[PDB]
Amino acid sequence: XXXXXXXXXXXXXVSLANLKPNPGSRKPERRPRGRRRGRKCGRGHKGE
Amino acid sequence: XXXXXXXXXXXXXXXXXXXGLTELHPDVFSTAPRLDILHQVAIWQKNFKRISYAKTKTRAEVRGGGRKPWVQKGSGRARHGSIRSPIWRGGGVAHGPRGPTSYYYMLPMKVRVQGLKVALTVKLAQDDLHIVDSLELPTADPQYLIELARYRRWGDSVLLVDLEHEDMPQNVVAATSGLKTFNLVPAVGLNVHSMLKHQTLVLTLPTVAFLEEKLXXXXXXXXX
Amino acid sequence: LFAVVHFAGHQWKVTAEDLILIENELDVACGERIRLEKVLLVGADNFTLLGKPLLGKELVRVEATVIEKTESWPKINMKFQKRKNYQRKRITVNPQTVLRINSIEXXXX
Amino acid sequence: LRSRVTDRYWRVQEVLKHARHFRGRKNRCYRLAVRAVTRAFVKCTRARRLKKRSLRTLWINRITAASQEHGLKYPAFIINLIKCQVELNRKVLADLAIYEPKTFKSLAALAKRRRXXXXXXXX
Amino acid sequence: MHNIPVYRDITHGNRQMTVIRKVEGDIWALQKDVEDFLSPLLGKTPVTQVNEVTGTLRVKGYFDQQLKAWLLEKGF
RNA sequence: GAUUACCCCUUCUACCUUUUGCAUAAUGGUUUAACCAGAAAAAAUCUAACAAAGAGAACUUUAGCUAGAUACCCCGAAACCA
């Protein structure tokens, strides 16, 4: 059913630029830089 | 059981002939092509080719000495250690690439195999895949190949997989000489990277034979 | 002879030929002619009519025309908290509508 | 390896572009420009919040004046307008208190009329 | 070979969910049949299909015995 | 904000750090440019491969196994030893 629906429409021939991962495949790695968590990078205030 | 029937057009490649008939049964075809697998295979193929030659020098690897530039207190200046410190403009970086590594990894056989299979399915159903009985290049000149690609209205980029690499000089000589459009590669050297690199695929009968043999044996080994 | 209307929760003093900007969109196509209610009416003969909590629909009328739907100059709204590391910057553009008052109708009862 | 390139210089250029007309280093230096910009925006919000208050107070003063010209005070006029079912805003009421003394005179007359009728009905 | 895939999925340590994979025919009809079959037994029909390039049938409960029996007797 | 193509009037107690609490007469900064300080996957969550099997002769396994993707930053001594 998906083969007929993929063969029916004319696509962009799927160039390497058209390659995309499935949703939730790779995590958007968190970077400590920002005003989200200030200056402590999630380590809290002082302490060891 | 659904049997896919693909028409193989035999071209004598001289000129003005699109006429040929052979009945092919590519059981290798898949219903829905996996984009995720293809992407992972491409990323991996890009990954193991990395040289990882990026280098730097941590403060310990700096030629500079570890002597204290001045007294800790009373100097009026800021507290400072060796001048090779990253806080100094004469120092390096701590988190830098200097420590080497290997960006490659071991990908399961079924994944890469299903990758090549799915890619082949993509090229198949995209009409960009054509099957021939043989290949002939009697004149062996660039002009002939160009005018052939223009007259027969082939794709902008065509990957030719025909030879077993052990024969047929007349073709290879002209095909491997100064041609950006067409690319050459043996039937046993066929890979997914080469297929995804080009917008059009052209295979011959022995090539399709060995390919379907390898892919049916790998699919049968993965199913069992 | 001038009138006082009410729209978008705001009351305005309207006169003939006047151009008045009202908040956001009236859901009316440009070029169309619309009618407005009347909070107050004052005639220049010093004759005033004030109904409550509204004026006569049959007695008096107000008709104006919409020129276009514009947007006011962007306003920068920023919230800042001291040593809380809290800063929020938001640029807000207030939508507006240009109304051209044409006919103020007054009839005798 | 990346580079600082034009990013920081463009951000500074933007802040300083918003720092124009400022006095001294604040229209020149970047840091003082930012420090002045934050205060400028806070003051923008606060003054835009208190603008309604200032205008309201001004209008109340004007209406109080125009009322006192007729012999009655502002609160009595407000009460009379409330019992007269008049929802007219103080802005338009002040505009009438300036340009159109006749309407305000009529409203004041009706105010004194309602006040005298209430004081006569209570007795 | 073995008849049909059967996926027992664990979302957490003590929590269990059932997962089926597409085999033969379209998923929609079989899903409707699953709903109609599980409706009298379970009392509800919490059937959900997740389709990307293939498909996954997910329901709330354990029908796996009836699942295997069904897909056996049917032959799909 | 008003106001004039400029200003007076009205509305407001620097930043940062450290703190129960700082415009604080607590801390750091002449200004500007540039340099400068979160790089580790076991178990887990998640995306895919196959499934009583996964994984490129090595291990796990009463739905597992394999692969990928997700979290633990710098500067500073007084001194010791050769």
Side-chain angles (χ1 to χ4, degrees), chain B residues 31-35 223-224, chain E residues 1 21-22 52-55:
Chain B
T31 314
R34 299 228 97 102
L35 301 179
Chain E
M1 211 63 60
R21 179 189 176 182
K22 175 188 180 180
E52 310 86 5
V53 190
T54 324

PDB file of all heavy atoms in Angstrom, chain B residues 31-35 223-224, chain E residues 1 21-22 52-55:
ATOM      1  N   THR B  31       8.466  -3.184   0.117  1.00  0.00           N
ATOM      2  CA  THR B  31       7.262  -2.361   0.091  1.00  0.00           C
ATOM      3  C   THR B  31       7.579  -0.894   0.382  1.00  0.00           C
ATOM      4  O   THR B  31       7.463  -0.040  -0.497  1.00  0.00           O
ATOM      5  CB  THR B  31       6.217  -2.868   1.103  1.00  0.00           C
ATOM      6  OG1 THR B  31       6.086  -4.291   0.988  1.00  0.00           O
ATOM      7  CG2 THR B  31       4.870  -2.227   0.838  1.00  0.00           C
ATOM      8  N   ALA B  32       7.981  -0.608   1.616  1.00  0.00           N
ATOM      9  CA  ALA B  32       8.327   0.753   2.013  1.00  0.00           C
ATOM     10  C   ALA B  32       9.818   0.902   2.302  1.00  0.00           C
ATOM     11  O   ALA B  32      10.358   0.211   3.165  1.00  0.00           O
ATOM     12  CB  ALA B  32       7.520   1.171   3.221  1.00  0.00           C
ATOM     13  N   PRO B  33      10.486   1.804   1.569  1.00  0.00           N
ATOM     14  CA  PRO B  33      11.903   2.114   1.791  1.00  0.00           C
ATOM     15  C   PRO B  33      12.145   2.797   3.135  1.00  0.00           C
ATOM     16  O   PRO B  33      11.430   3.736   3.481  1.00  0.00           O
ATOM     17  CB  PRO B  33      12.241   3.065   0.638  1.00  0.00           C
ATOM     18  CG  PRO B  33      11.168   2.846  -0.381  1.00  0.00           C
ATOM     19  CD  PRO B  33       9.943   2.526   0.409  1.00  0.00           C
ATOM     20  N   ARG B  34      13.149   2.334   3.877  1.00  0.00           N
ATOM     21  CA  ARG B  34      13.490   2.939   5.160  1.00  0.00           C
ATOM     22  C   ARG B  34      14.441   4.117   4.981  1.00  0.00           C
ATOM     23  O   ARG B  34      15.540   3.964   4.452  1.00  0.00           O
ATOM     24  CB  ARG B  34      14.119   1.906   6.099  1.00  0.00           C
ATOM     25  CG  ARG B  34      13.219   0.732   6.447  1.00  0.00           C
ATOM     26  CD  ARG B  34      13.215   0.471   7.946  1.00  0.00           C
ATOM     27  NE  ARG B  34      12.068   1.080   8.615  1.00  0.00           N
ATOM     28  CZ  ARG B  34      10.990   0.405   9.002  1.00  0.00           C
ATOM     29  NH1 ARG B  34      10.917  -0.903   8.792  1.00  0.00           N
ATOM     30  NH2 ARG B  34       9.989   1.030   9.605  1.00  0.00           N
ATOM     31  N   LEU B  35      14.008   5.291   5.426  1.00  0.00           N
ATOM     32  CA  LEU B  35      14.844   6.484   5.373  1.00  0.00           C
ATOM     33  C   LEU B  35      15.857   6.481   6.513  1.00  0.00           C
ATOM     34  O   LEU B  35      16.987   6.949   6.357  1.00  0.00           O
ATOM     35  CB  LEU B  35      13.983   7.746   5.433  1.00  0.00           C
ATOM     36  CG  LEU B  35      12.939   7.908   4.325  1.00  0.00           C
ATOM     37  CD1 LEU B  35      12.148   9.193   4.517  1.00  0.00           C
ATOM     38  CD2 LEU B  35      13.601   7.879   2.957  1.00  0.00           C
ATOM     39  N   UNK B 223      16.658 -13.857   7.579  1.00  0.00           N
ATOM     40  CA  UNK B 223      15.341 -14.332   7.970  1.00  0.00           C
ATOM     41  C   UNK B 223      15.450 -15.580   8.809  1.00  0.00           C
ATOM     42  O   UNK B 223      14.594 -15.803   9.693  1.00  0.00           O
ATOM     43  CB  UNK B 223      14.455 -14.559   6.743  1.00  0.00           C
ATOM     44  N   UNK B 224      16.477 -16.390   8.570  1.00  0.00           N
ATOM     45  CA  UNK B 224      16.655 -17.626   9.309  1.00  0.00           C
ATOM     46  C   UNK B 224      17.419 -17.352  10.572  1.00  0.00           C
ATOM     47  O   UNK B 224      16.907 -17.684  11.662  1.00  0.00           O
ATOM     48  CB  UNK B 224      17.417 -18.634   8.456  1.00  0.00           C
TER      49      UNK B 224
ATOM     50  N   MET E   1      10.326 -22.049   9.680  1.00  0.00           N
ATOM     51  CA  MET E   1      10.342 -20.770  10.378  1.00  0.00           C
ATOM     52  C   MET E   1       9.246 -20.728  11.439  1.00  0.00           C
ATOM     53  O   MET E   1       8.494 -21.690  11.604  1.00  0.00           O
ATOM     54  CB  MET E   1      10.171 -19.616   9.384  1.00  0.00           C
ATOM     55  CG  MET E   1      10.881 -18.331   9.784  1.00  0.00           C
ATOM     56  SD  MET E   1      12.671 -18.526   9.874  1.00  0.00           S
ATOM     57  CE  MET E   1      13.043 -19.005   8.190  1.00  0.00           C
ATOM     58  N   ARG E  21       3.606  -6.535  14.982  1.00  0.00           N
ATOM     59  CA  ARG E  21       4.233  -6.048  13.759  1.00  0.00           C
ATOM     60  C   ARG E  21       3.430  -6.455  12.525  1.00  0.00           C
ATOM     61  O   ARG E  21       2.854  -7.544  12.479  1.00  0.00           O
ATOM     62  CB  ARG E  21       5.667  -6.576  13.653  1.00  0.00           C
ATOM     63  CG  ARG E  21       6.407  -6.143  12.400  1.00  0.00           C
ATOM     64  CD  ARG E  21       7.728  -6.878  12.259  1.00  0.00           C
ATOM     65  NE  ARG E  21       8.409  -6.543  11.012  1.00  0.00           N
ATOM     66  CZ  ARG E  21       9.565  -7.076  10.629  1.00  0.00           C
ATOM     67  NH1 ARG E  21      10.172  -7.971  11.395  1.00  0.00           N
ATOM     68  NH2 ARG E  21      10.113  -6.713   9.477  1.00  0.00           N
ATOM     69  N   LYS E  22       3.389  -5.572  11.530  1.00  0.00           N
ATOM     70  CA  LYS E  22       2.707  -5.846  10.269  1.00  0.00           C
ATOM     71  C   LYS E  22       3.318  -7.044   9.548  1.00  0.00           C
ATOM     72  O   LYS E  22       4.539  -7.156   9.437  1.00  0.00           O
ATOM     73  CB  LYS E  22       2.754  -4.613   9.363  1.00  0.00           C
ATOM     74  CG  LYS E  22       2.175  -4.835   7.975  1.00  0.00           C
ATOM     75  CD  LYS E  22       2.433  -3.639   7.074  1.00  0.00           C
ATOM     76  CE  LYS E  22       1.848  -3.856   5.688  1.00  0.00           C
ATOM     77  NZ  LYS E  22       2.086  -2.686   4.798  1.00  0.00           N
ATOM     78  N   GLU E  52       5.400   4.112  10.581  1.00  0.00           N
ATOM     79  CA  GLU E  52       6.446   4.752   9.786  1.00  0.00           C
ATOM     80  C   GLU E  52       7.219   3.681   9.022  1.00  0.00           C
ATOM     81  O   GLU E  52       7.947   2.893   9.629  1.00  0.00           O
ATOM     82  CB  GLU E  52       7.399   5.565  10.667  1.00  0.00           C
ATOM     83  CG  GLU E  52       6.721   6.527  11.633  1.00  0.00           C
ATOM     84  CD  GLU E  52       6.327   5.863  12.937  1.00  0.00           C
ATOM     85  OE1 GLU E  52       6.673   4.677  13.130  1.00  0.00           O
ATOM     86  OE2 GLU E  52       5.674   6.523  13.772  1.00  0.00           O
ATOM     87  N   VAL E  53       7.046   3.647   7.699  1.00  0.00           N
ATOM     88  CA  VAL E  53       7.726   2.700   6.799  1.00  0.00           C
ATOM     89  C   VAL E  53       7.295   1.243   7.068  1.00  0.00           C
ATOM     90  O   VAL E  53       7.512   0.345   6.254  1.00  0.00           O
ATOM     91  CB  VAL E  53       9.271   2.827   6.904  1.00  0.00           C
ATOM     92  CG1 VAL E  53       9.958   2.041   5.804  1.00  0.00           C
ATOM     93  CG2 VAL E  53       9.692   4.287   6.833  1.00  0.00           C
ATOM     94  N   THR E  54       6.651   1.036   8.210  1.00  0.00           N
ATOM     95  CA  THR E  54       6.123  -0.253   8.642  1.00  0.00           C
ATOM     96  C   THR E  54       5.137   0.123   9.738  1.00  0.00           C
ATOM     97  O   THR E  54       4.874   1.306   9.931  1.00  0.00           O
ATOM     98  CB  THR E  54       7.213  -1.220   9.163  1.00  0.00           C
ATOM     99  OG1 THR E  54       8.413  -1.065   8.396  1.00  0.00           O
ATOM    100  CG2 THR E  54       6.747  -2.669   9.062  1.00  0.00           C
ATOM    101  N   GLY E  55       4.612  -0.841  10.485  1.00  0.00           N
ATOM    102  CA  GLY E  55       3.612  -0.492  11.475  1.00  0.00           C
ATOM    103  C   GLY E  55       3.627  -1.320  12.740  1.00  0.00           C
ATOM    104  O   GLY E  55       4.139  -2.438  12.777  1.00  0.00           O
TER     105      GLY E  55
END
